[PDB]
Amino acid sequence: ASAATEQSPIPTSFERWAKPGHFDRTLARGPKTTTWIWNLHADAHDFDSHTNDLQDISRKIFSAHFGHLAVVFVWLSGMYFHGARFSNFSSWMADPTHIRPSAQVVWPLVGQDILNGDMGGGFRGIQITSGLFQMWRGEGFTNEFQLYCTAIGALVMAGLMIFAGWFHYHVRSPKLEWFQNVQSMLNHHLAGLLGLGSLGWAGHLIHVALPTNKLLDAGVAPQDIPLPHEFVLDKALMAELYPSFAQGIRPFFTLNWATYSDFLTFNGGLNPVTGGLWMTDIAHHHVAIAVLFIFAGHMYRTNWGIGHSIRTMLEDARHPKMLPFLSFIGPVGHRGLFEVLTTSWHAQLSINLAMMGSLSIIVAQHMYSMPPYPYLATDYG
Amino acid sequence: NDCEVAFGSPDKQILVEPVFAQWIQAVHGKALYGISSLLSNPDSIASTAWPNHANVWLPGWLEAINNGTNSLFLA
Ligand code: CLA
Ligand code: CLA
Numbered sequence A: 001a002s003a004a005t006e007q008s009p010i011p012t013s014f015e016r017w018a019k020p021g022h023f024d025r026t027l028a029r030g031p032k033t034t035t036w037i038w039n040l041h042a043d044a045h046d047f048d049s050h051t052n053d054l055q056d057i058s059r060k061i062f063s064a065h066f067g068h069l070a071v072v073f074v075w076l077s078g079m080y081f082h083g084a085r086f087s088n089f090s091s092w093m094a095d096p097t098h099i100r101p102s103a104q105v106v107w108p109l110v111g112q113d114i115l116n117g118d119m120g121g122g123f124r125g126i127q128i129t130s131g132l133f134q135m136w137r138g139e140g141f142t143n144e145f146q147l148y149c150t151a152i153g154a155l156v157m158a159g160l161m162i163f164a165g166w167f168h169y170h171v172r173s174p175k176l177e178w179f180q181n182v183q184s185m186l187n188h189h190l191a192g193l194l195g196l197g198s199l200g201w202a203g204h205l206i207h208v209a210l211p212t213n214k215l216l217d218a219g220v221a222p223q224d225i226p227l228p229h230e231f232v233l234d235k236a237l238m239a240e241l242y243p244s245f246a247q248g249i250r251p252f253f254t255l256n257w258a259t260y261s262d263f264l265t266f267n268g269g270l271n272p273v274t275g276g277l278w279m280t281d282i283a284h285h286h287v288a289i290a291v292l293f294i295f296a297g298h299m300y301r302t303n304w305g306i307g308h309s310i311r312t313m314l315e316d317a318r319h320p321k322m323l324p325f326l327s328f329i330g331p332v333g334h335r336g337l338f339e340v341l342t343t344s345w346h347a348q349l350s351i352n353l354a355m356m357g358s359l360s361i362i363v364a365q366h367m368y369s370m371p372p373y374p375y376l377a378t379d380y381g
Numbered sequence B: 001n002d003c004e005v006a007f008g009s010p011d012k013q014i015l016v017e018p019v020f021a022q023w024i025q026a027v028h029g030k031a032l033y034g035i036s037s038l039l040s041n042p043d044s045i046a047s048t049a050w051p052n053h054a055n056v057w058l059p060g061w062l063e064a065i066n067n068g069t070n071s072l073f074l075a
């Protein structure tokens, strides 16, 4: 307890598993025909039909989100494990222009090992086109043990995510007033999820990825490269690569930022060695958008007076307060939309799916033309 | 057969011969296979028309069915 918002019932019972259709009143009747079998999976996740309280539906949605995050962590663990056990990642790390990325080998069964093609270096496997190798090279991975460690960490995170979804429903589930705090959610997601996330990744890039990639582009063999923590540990090794790390974190507080202009570059092109974007330019990007997203997260009034109220901003966007040619939306405007979006989960899901699909399309159109990983643009598959 | 040929084994295909239609090809006088059936057998009851010997169609028809260049009873 810390915010006094939980005390959820629905005791973890086992008997409620041998009675399919328990969620719907007509689904728990008694099958009769076969349409029931198909109806079982047609509205299994539709928690809106099952019950009528918005708070119970919100609790169910929150725990379903946690279980989904667990599924995605299991998938990530599997991808890192495939790159750490059934891959030619080290071979590709040595020669990423003549070796074909492969992270899947087929068992020698009926006619089946013909799918294991020669990938260069004597490796008989399937050529993966997921871009995992190019991503791991840019992040800072050099050997497969680091990939195995990341796989174990993702599996641990998956177990942790399936405990957070059981603890936020079967032990201490939030109240509806917590879910309706869109101001706090926007503040935290904008400043703590996106802002601090990209700030932490900029820290990783400045201390792990930029070193490793600079040595890789220089010509150093992958197991001749120091491990990332030495880049973090001693500043002499890191100051050999960059001469702006000799002044430490002093030019930042005294606002002498052009001192840092050799690892926060603003080149804006492609690395000729790798083919990907300039790694220093990437780190500078993440620093700038961290400063932008954190600053954006202090916009909405939460518990301290300062901020906006989205309800006020919505209710004021109306004639005669609009631009004169935009005044056709009338004297009510967006008045009832804050209560639409804080009481309907479907309205929120519609907006978020539209933005998520549009942003995935934007991701597709920005990664062929500005290839953001080493040796990505040349692997056309 | 697709999965055998794709996995580099055209020899492991299941190839079943149409033995009944190959035999009906033989009962008309096709010597393409090793089936000495009715009109393929030159001194058979069907080929000779024993009491009558009036099948005056037999040599002309076997000049055409054995001719492996027309479409009459393709292999
Ligand atoms: C100790 C383990 C445990 C037990 C005994 C229960 C028991 C219960 N839970 Mg549950 N829960 C758990 C863990 C557990 N939970 C965890 C770890 C989470 C976080 C994800 C949840 C989150 C959760 C929610 C949101 C809800 C419940 C509900 C319920 C109750 C109804 C059961 C039911 O719906 O039939 C279902 C029987 C099943 C076998 C469900 C299987 C589905 C799972 C998630 C597997 C699907 C993932 C799939 C494999 C992904 C790959 C897809 C594949 C095709 C590729 C029941 C008493 C529901 C309730 O209260 O009913 C009113 C409710 O809505 N639980
Ligand atoms: C504008 C935001 C933005 C952009 C352009 C990037 C770009 C990049 N990131 Mg990322 N990142 C971001 C935000 C962003 N990041 C945030 C907020 C986090 C914390 C959650 C991260 C955490 C992160 C990790 C862990 C990693 C990266 C990596 C990368 C590089 C890989 C390619 C890629 O992601 O596709 C390009 C992405 C886009 C085209 C769109 C980004 C989607 C954001 C979330 C939308 C933000 C909305 C904002 C208002 C922008 C305006 C709308 C816009 C879509 C037009 C690339 C240069 C990888 C790397 O190795 O670097 C070399 C890597 O592993 N990032």
Ligand SMILES: CC1=C(/C=C/C(C)=C/C=C/C(C)=C/C=C/C=C(C)/C=C/C=C(C)/C=C/C2=C(C)CCCC2(C)C)C(C)(C)CCC1
Pocket (backbone or CB within 6 Å): A076, A149, A150, A151, A153, A154, A157, A196, A197, A199, A200, A201
């Ligand atoms: C990849 C991956 C993974 C991993 C992850 C990780 C590894 C993590 C992390 C991490 C992180 C994420 C870290 C970070 C951090 C951080 C941050 C975020 C920071 C900050 C800060 C700040 C903001 C500052 C402030 C201040 C100022 C302003 C000045 C004065 C001082 C002070 C302090 C006050 C896993 C395995 C899970 C799974 C798979 C995937």
Ligand SMILES: CC1=C(/C=C/C(C)=C/C=CC(/C)=C/C=C/C=C(C)/C=C\C=C(C)\C=C\C2=C(C)CCCC2(C)C)C(C)(C)CCC1
Pocket (backbone or CB within 6 Å): A072, A192, A193, A196, A197, A198, A200, A201
């Ligand atoms: C797109 C996508 C994806 C990916 C994702 C990712 C990769 C992500 C994320 C994310 C991230 C990247 C994140 C993050 C985060 C971070 C955070 C959230 C933080 C923080 C903070 C803090 C909490 C800190 C604290 C501290 C400490 C630690 C101590 C000292 C002080 C300080 C303050 C510094 C996938 C494909 C999978 C799927 C689909 C979608």
Ligand SMILES: CCCCCCCCCCCCO[C@@H]1O[C@H](CO)[C@@H](O[C@H]2O[C@H](CO)[C@@H](O)[C@H](O)[C@H]2O)[C@H](O)[C@H]1O
Pocket (backbone or CB within 6 Å): B052, B053, B054, B055, B056
């Ligand atoms: C205006 C009234 C019309 C009424 C028509 C009624 C239909 C008439 C049917 C005519 C049928 C002819 O069918 C009969 O076939 C026999 C078959 O051996 C022919 O026989 C033929 O076979 C021998 C082979 O040994 C041939 O070498 C020869 O050219 C010929 O004789 C007869 O010559 C003919 O008489």
